[PDB]
Curated annotation (Swiss-Prot):
Inhibited by n-undecyl phosphonate (C11Y4). Inhibited by paraoxon. The gene is CUT1. It comes from Fusarium vanettenii. Changing V168A: Increases activity on p-nitrophenyl butyrate and poly(ethylene terephthalate) (PET). The lineage of its organism: Eukaryota, Fungi, Dikarya, Ascomycota, Pezizomycotina. Disulfide bonds join C15-C93, C155-C162. Its EC number is 3.1.1.74. The 2 disulfide bonds play a critical role in holding the catalytic residues in juxta-position; reduction of the disulfide bridges results in the complete inactivation of the enzyme. O-glycosylated; contains one mole each of mannose, arabinose, N-acetylglucosamine, and glucuronic acid. This is Cutinase 1. Optimum pH is 8.
Length: 197
């Protein structure tokens, strides 16, 4: 449901081919929040339950609303947590293709983590999806040090966080359809582009 720790719980002897690491939005529950489960179900349909590991960013990431105001759009502790998960994935399953995503503060967290990641691991992330990207204007719709072709940003018209502010308006909560269709569609396509079929 809202909590998935497939990477942490997973057996190194039976690694999935695809590992998805996702960061929830502010004040959301579990480690997947409102959008994560929808993406997860569709990834499982495409790759099979044993084919993909779903891992939310929990631990030190409290998804505290106020942290949106910090320099990187989230806390240092949260970035360390997500970096640690990418590092665990790389160590536990060196041959798995990685994919990532984040919503709202989670999108800033995903961008900050990916920017700080060792390039060898970052290069294994075949595609990243960002919803209501809080640093969209500041980063010109990109994740620093990460290719534009592997990035997909979903920023609704009227979602003020996509236009340089931290005001939360109704369009910020209208990413449901994207999480159910185009976001997993993009992730699946990017994984198949490099893994083949």
């Amino acid at each position: 449901r809202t909590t998935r720790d497939d990477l942490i719980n997973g057996n190194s002897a039976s690694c999935a081919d695809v590992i998805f690491i996702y960061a929830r939005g502010s004040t959301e529950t579990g480690n997947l929040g409102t959008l994560g489960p929808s993406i997860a179900s569709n990834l499982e349909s495409a790759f099979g339950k044993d084919g993909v590991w779903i891992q939310g960013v929990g631990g030190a990431y409290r998804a505290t609303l106020g942290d949106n105001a910090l320099p990187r759009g989230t806390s240092s502790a949260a970035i360390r947590e997500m970096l640690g998960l990418f590092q665990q994935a790389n160590t536990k399953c060196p041959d798995a293709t990685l994919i990532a995503g984040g919503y709202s503060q989670g999108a800033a967290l995903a961008a900050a983590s990916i920017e700080d990641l060792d390039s060898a691991i970052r290069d294994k992330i075949a595609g990243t999806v960002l919803f209501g990207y809080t640093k969209n204007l500041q980063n010109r719709g990109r994740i620093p040090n990460y290719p534009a072709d592997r990035t997909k940003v979903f920023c609704n018209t009227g979602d003020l966080v996509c236009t340089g502010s931290l005001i939360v308006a109704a369009p910020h909560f209208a990413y449901g359809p994207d999480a159910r269709g185009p976001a997993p569609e993009f992730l699946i396509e990017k994984v198949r582009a490099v893994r083949g079929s």
